[PDB]
Enzyme design. Sequence first.
Site, short mmCIF file in Angstrom:
data_model
loop_
_atom_site.label_atom_id
_atom_site.label_comp_id
_atom_site.label_asym_id
_atom_site.label_seq_id
_atom_site.Cartn_x
_atom_site.Cartn_y
_atom_site.Cartn_z
N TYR B 18 -17.01 -9.46 -3.22
CA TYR B 18 -17.60 -9.43 -4.58
C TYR B 18 -18.08 -10.81 -5.02
O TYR B 18 -17.72 -11.31 -6.09
CB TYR B 18 -16.62 -8.86 -5.59
CG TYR B 18 -15.89 -7.67 -5.04
CD1 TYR B 18 -14.65 -7.83 -4.43
CD2 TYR B 18 -16.45 -6.40 -5.08
CE1 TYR B 18 -13.98 -6.76 -3.90
CE2 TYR B 18 -15.79 -5.32 -4.54
CZ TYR B 18 -14.55 -5.51 -3.96
OH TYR B 18 -13.84 -4.46 -3.41
N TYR B 150 -9.11 2.89 -8.57
CA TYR B 150 -9.95 2.27 -7.57
C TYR B 150 -9.74 2.97 -6.23
O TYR B 150 -8.60 3.25 -5.86
CB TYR B 150 -9.66 0.77 -7.43
CG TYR B 150 -10.45 0.10 -6.33
CD1 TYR B 150 -11.76 -0.34 -6.56
CD2 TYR B 150 -9.90 -0.08 -5.06
CE1 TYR B 150 -12.49 -0.95 -5.56
CE2 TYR B 150 -10.62 -0.68 -4.05
CZ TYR B 150 -11.91 -1.12 -4.31
OH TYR B 150 -12.61 -1.72 -3.30
N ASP B 247 -4.40 8.83 -3.20
CA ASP B 247 -4.83 7.62 -2.51
C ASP B 247 -3.66 6.66 -2.49
O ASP B 247 -3.35 6.02 -3.49
CB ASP B 247 -6.05 7.01 -3.19
CG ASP B 247 -6.60 5.84 -2.42
OD1 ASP B 247 -5.92 5.32 -1.51
OD2 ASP B 247 -7.72 5.41 -2.76
N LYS B 276 -3.94 -0.04 3.87
CA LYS B 276 -3.77 -1.54 3.85
C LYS B 276 -2.66 -2.03 4.77
O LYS B 276 -2.90 -2.76 5.74
CB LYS B 276 -3.59 -2.06 2.41
CG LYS B 276 -4.87 -2.01 1.56
CD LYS B 276 -4.72 -2.69 0.19
CE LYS B 276 -6.04 -3.01 -0.54
NZ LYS B 276 -6.55 -1.71 -0.95
C1 LIG Z 1 -7.76 -1.35 -1.04
C2 LIG Z 1 -7.99 0.07 -1.43
C3 LIG Z 1 -9.09 0.92 -0.90
C4 LIG Z 1 -10.18 0.42 0.03
O1 LIG Z 1 -9.75 0.11 1.35
P1 LIG Z 1 -10.74 -0.76 2.28
O2 LIG Z 1 -10.02 -0.79 3.61
O3 LIG Z 1 -10.80 -2.08 1.57
O4 LIG Z 1 -12.04 0.01 2.26
C5 LIG Z 1 -9.17 2.25 -1.34
N1 LIG Z 1 -8.29 2.80 -2.19
C6 LIG Z 1 -7.24 2.13 -2.72
C7 LIG Z 1 -6.27 2.78 -3.67
C8 LIG Z 1 -7.04 0.71 -2.35
O5 LIG Z 1 -5.99 0.03 -2.87
#
Ligand SMILES: *Cc1c(COP(=O)(O)O)cnc(C)c1O
Lengths: 429, 429
Positions: B18, B150, B247, B276
């Site tokens: 970003y 997010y 997520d 992650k």
């Molecule tokens: C970090 C994150 C993502 C994106 O993962 P990338 O490997 O950076 O594309 C998606 N959803 C959540 C909840 C996250 O914390």
Amino acid sequence: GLTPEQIIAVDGAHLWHPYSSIGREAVSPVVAVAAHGAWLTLIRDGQPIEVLDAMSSWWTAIHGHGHPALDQALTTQLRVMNHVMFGGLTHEPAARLAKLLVDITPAGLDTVFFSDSGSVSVEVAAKMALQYWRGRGLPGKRRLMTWRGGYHGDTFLAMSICDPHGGMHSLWTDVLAAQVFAPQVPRDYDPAYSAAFEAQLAQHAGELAAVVVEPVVQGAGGMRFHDPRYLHDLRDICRRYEVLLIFDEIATGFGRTGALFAADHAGVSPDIMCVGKALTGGYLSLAATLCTADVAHTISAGAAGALMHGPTFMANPLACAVSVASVELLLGQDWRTRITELAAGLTAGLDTARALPAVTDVRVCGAIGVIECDRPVDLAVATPAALDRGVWLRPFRNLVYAMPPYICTPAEITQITSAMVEVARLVGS
Amino acid sequence: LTPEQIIAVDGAHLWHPYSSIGREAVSPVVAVAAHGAWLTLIRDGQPIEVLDAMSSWWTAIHGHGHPALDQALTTQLRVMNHVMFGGLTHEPAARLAKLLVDITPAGLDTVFFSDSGSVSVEVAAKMALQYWRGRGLPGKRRLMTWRGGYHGDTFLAMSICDPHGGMHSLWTDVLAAQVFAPQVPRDYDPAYSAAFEAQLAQHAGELAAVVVEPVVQGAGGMRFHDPRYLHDLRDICRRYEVLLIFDEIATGFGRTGALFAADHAGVSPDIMCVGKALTGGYLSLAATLCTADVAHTISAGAAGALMHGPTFMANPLACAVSVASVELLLGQDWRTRITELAAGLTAGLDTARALPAVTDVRVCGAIGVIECDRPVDLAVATPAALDRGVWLRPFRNLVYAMPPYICTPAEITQITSAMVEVARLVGSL
Ligand SMILES: *Cc1c(COP(=O)(O)O)cnc(C)c1O
Ligand SMILES: CC(=O)c1ccc(N2CCC(C(=O)c3cccc(Cl)c3)CC2)cc1
Ligand SMILES: *Cc1c(COP(=O)(O)O)cnc(C)c1O
């Protein structure tokens, strides 16, 4: 620890595969237990056999598996720093790779945005394109144009510019963005095609951000080649109507088509470029999107002030370090001669197949050889046939093809092509 | 390259997350090593040890260079770097899938590997859409979520990110239009659930799924909410026939004090994303899980397959390190460890409640947050944390840490102490 029969049981119950089902697979996947140089060790009938990786494991293993220079590069970076977050930090693997990539890509591509996969780099490229025009005061310039037969990845924006048949766009009614498709780009140069492309683009120019194409070679949409002079025309058309040009070189990059990048066959520079499959020499998922200084600065002077994208593992030190070695290993040899010999090997090995009854075409471009057939290839027959000749082949639709590692010896090409010819022989009977 | 050479290459050729090109208010700091909980950074020509309070964007749960993960990587490197997952399967994929199926919320039986969290979110939406098409309900194609979330940077993932946090004003006409409920509160308020149901009722027939981060919303604002909202989401999704997608790319693998944040509520979603910390912060990798029912329904639908297959799907190297990472987590008493981490964060951060520019202090598992009354100037906060021997990356108005699980009590107090001083400087000027 797991025996291959346990691997198969776990796999059947729990593992999705590319474009696959759970519980409705026509044949089990085959357990791979090792991979070294141009060779994989697979389990056929409970016994390990060594077969040639004629696909380079989906375009990736250009230097072969377990190359000692790339193993050592990964092991060396592993001792210092596995990974750091790229927000607020930078490092040597990232800088070295960016240095290498800006130097060997077509002229004008000065900035490098790393991501984790080819699909993502494509969406990054689209986001670059759309933010570029917003920074120019033209938010209407937001659709993509492409020609039919292409492939750009499986994320939803990438899907929108994939070939509508290959991409089953009928199954995605009211989901995908509606992009502008020109007709299938032909094999032989016909200026009338470029004229027709220009005319269709002209009436969309004010809503188009970019043209996105694979240069010279269209991979997953059909292993089709086109005259590079078409790319020359797109460049001129895009320049004249003020639409950006994006080259998706995720499968064509790094010598695969006889030139270091397929754009080099035309001597043309895109505004934006994507790379991926071979970038790490087939070791690890990594991709990059490159753009000109003009694109970079226009986005950055944009009202948003920045490119709103940032993958967690952006510029991963492990993947960058092996990619550095993979690229240097490629530039450190007479790679152009190497690919030429591979192409000549493929041309000679597959020439038999032209006269076969079920074959409509045999074509070679750099280290890529294709037998096109007049009907679907039954994988249930083709896969055992190739294995019995010690070659891993993965036909799809009516295509029997190979993209072999650059390290394949003449004898190994002859073994690969002989297996392909025989697969095409059984297509008839 | 020297640090200075890295800085020159970086400023010229690298995009950062970003960020702009050539308009960075701050230069990135060159990182040259990482071992355990510590980064070696170059400050004023000199290397310094600082604590990785961010866990390199919430990935390095076991610290960098853990011998168990290093070895798992080198051991897999010796046998097989990578093979294509189309037509083939292998041990690290089978073991990792067996692991994930066994430890994720009950009923999550199938595993789709991809290369990043954003892609895994697109895979989840694709699963949900193909599911309802399998059921003859192709109008169930929209998504519902609550504000503040997010889910990544690709274009479908962007469509469910908070329409302010993701600058959706900057992405109209481009993004799919999704269904947004108001920000979920921290304390359990039964009326919020009632209104969520009432909004979902007006869209059930066009909704494929609810998608939320469970318990902790990360990049959208480090907000916590009461687990019982997840119970209500489960029941509402059940009664209205809308799938539930959690997520857990940020919350997974112990971060919030349960193995997965869904476990705080005992809830199982239909589809789950992880990413992650999946590989212990070594390599990019992600996974999307779904129930047997979703898989069998997709597999019996018109396509007969999930329409997705990334090049590096189920990368043996990434999978092997993840196996080690997950087993290392399971084979210690992680719950007590995270409980102790959380107590250290709570005790260490309590003193910030009284600072004049601090509006909230909150801890949840290995997550500590000081909410300030104004955006945090990185040009002040970064050197000030580095002066205190800690790597801190504030964003918006939040001074926060997600420390590696291996942090001793004293390292945690060192982290919270730096955060307290950073917040003290916010109200100074
Ligand atoms: C970090 C994150 C993502 C994106 O993962 P990338 O490997 O950076 O594309 C998606 N959803 C959540 C909840 C996250 O914390
Ligand atoms: C890594 C690996 O082994 C692998 C194997 C197969 C694979 N596919 C399967 C066939 C798919 C296809 O034809 C297609 C799909 C959508 C649009 C278009 Cl134009 C074409 C393309 C991807 C991907 C990876
Ligand atoms: C393989 C491929 C992609 C997508 O790469 P992934 O890493 O699978 O996302 C995109 N474009 C082209 C031309 C490709 O060949």
